[PDB]
Amino acid sequence: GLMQFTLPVRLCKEIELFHFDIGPFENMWPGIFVYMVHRSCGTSCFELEKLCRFIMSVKKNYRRVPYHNWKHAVTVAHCMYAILQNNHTLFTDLERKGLLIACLCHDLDHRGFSNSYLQKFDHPLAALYSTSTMEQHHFSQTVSILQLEGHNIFSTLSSSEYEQVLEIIRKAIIATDLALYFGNRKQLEEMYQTGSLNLNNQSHRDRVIGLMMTACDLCSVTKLWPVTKLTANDIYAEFWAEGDEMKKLGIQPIPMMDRDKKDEVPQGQLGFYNAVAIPCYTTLTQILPPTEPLLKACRDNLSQWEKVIRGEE
Ligand SMILES: CCOc1cc(CSc2nc3ccc4ncsc4c3[nH]2)ncc1C
Ligand SMILES: [Mg+2]
Ligand SMILES: [Zn+2]
Numbered sequence: 423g424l425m426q427f428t429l430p431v432r433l434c435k436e437i438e439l440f441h442f443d444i445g446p447f448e449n450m451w452p453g454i455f456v457y458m459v460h461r462s463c464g465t466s467c468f469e470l471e472k473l474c475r476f477i478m479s480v481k482k483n484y485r486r487v488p489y490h491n492w493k494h495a496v497t498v499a500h501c502m503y504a505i506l507q508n509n510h511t512l513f514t515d516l517e518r519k520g521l522l523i524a525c526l527c528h529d530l531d532h533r534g535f536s537n538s539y540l541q542k543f544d545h546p547l548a549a550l551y552s553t554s555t556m557e558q559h560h561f562s563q564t565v566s567i568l569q570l571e572g573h574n575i576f577s578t579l580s581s582s583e584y585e586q587v588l589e590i591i592r593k594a595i596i597a598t599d600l601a602l603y604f605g606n607r608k609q610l611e612e613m614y615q616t617g618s619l620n621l622n623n624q625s626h627r628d629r630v631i632g633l634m635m636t637a638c639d640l641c642s643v644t645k646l647w648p649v650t651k652l653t654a655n656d657i658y659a660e661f662w663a664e665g666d667e668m669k670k671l672g673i674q675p676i677p678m679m680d681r682d683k684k685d686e687v688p689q690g691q692l693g694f695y696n697a698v699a700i701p702c703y704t705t706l707t708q709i710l711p712p713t714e715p716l717l718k719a720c721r722d723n724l725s726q727w728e729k730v731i732r733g734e735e
Contacts, residue, residue, distance in 0.1 A: 440504045455526060456477070458503040500641075506522075521634070524635070527561075537556055554601070606629055630709055700717070
């Protein structure tokens with residue numbers, strides 16, 4: 423109970439910033455997550471014995487893929503930690519508990535292939551879950567790990583609080599399905615502008631949590647340029663493999679996944695920042711003003727990609 427996790431000074435300071443990189447030392451990542459749980463939630467939220475055993479089962483169930491791996495899980499959890507820390511009073515105890523676990527679990531057992539590829543392959547998961555295929559899988563896997571003997575970090579919640587936390591984690595994970603983001607943000611955009619946005623309305627909270635999940639999930643674009651640039655290599659490493667596998671099914675992949683169209687990456691990144699990233703962090707900044715550093719970081723990276731196209735780098 424009196425056992426705090428501590429970090430070295432540089433990490434202790436930088437971990438509070440939205441653009442923190444968790445570093446290349448894998449064996450530090452559990453401690454960083456537990457540190458974040460303790461400061462965001464309390465040293466009491468979870469029995470440490472059970473949280474540590476949960477963290478290591480979650481880690482085990484992430485695969486060795488270029489991007490959708492254990493590093494991504496902790497990265498996305500850190501972005502959520504920074505949102506929650508900069509919005510102290512706006513979220514319940516249950517929400518702070520649920521959302522960090524949701525982010526850690528959001529890509530459990532990812533194979534490095536999109537919902538599209540599972541459907542064209544005719545993967546069994548595409549028959550079990552017609553829409554948001556991987557995201558329903560990710561939640562399924564979260565439930566399974568929670569039900570391993572000694573792994574139920576929520577044991578000390580009431581029956582109703584336990585159903586509420588599982589429901590927060592379920593919506594949060596399904597929201598990471600980018601196909602659902604566009605509608606969710608348009609709806610939030612209308613509600614903020616016409617002035618009908620109400621954070622005591624559960625259906626509104628759900629939409630706002632959904633947008634946070636998208637923002638944490640895309641947070642690669644909100645780092646300093648060298649981190650953003652180096653992460654894109656891993657993102658494209660998965661996309662191009664999927665592209666290869668499309669060609670194996672006798673289907674021309676979209677240019678984003680065709681390694682023969684590497685040259686169009688800078689221009690494809692512009693459309694992605696303009697169509698997805700900037701609108702995401704803009705609506706989040708309007709709803710949660712303290713998350714503005716993410717919009718600024720995103721606009722900085724948009725500008726760095728504009729410079730790449732102009733041959734300046
Ligand atoms: C959820 C997807 O997240 C991403 C996705 C991407 C890739 S976006 C992207 N869109 C396109 C469109 C055409 C194209 N032609 C060659 S590369 C390329 C693209 N890359 N970068 C960063 C992040 C965080
Ligand atoms: Mg995902
Ligand atoms: Zn993700």
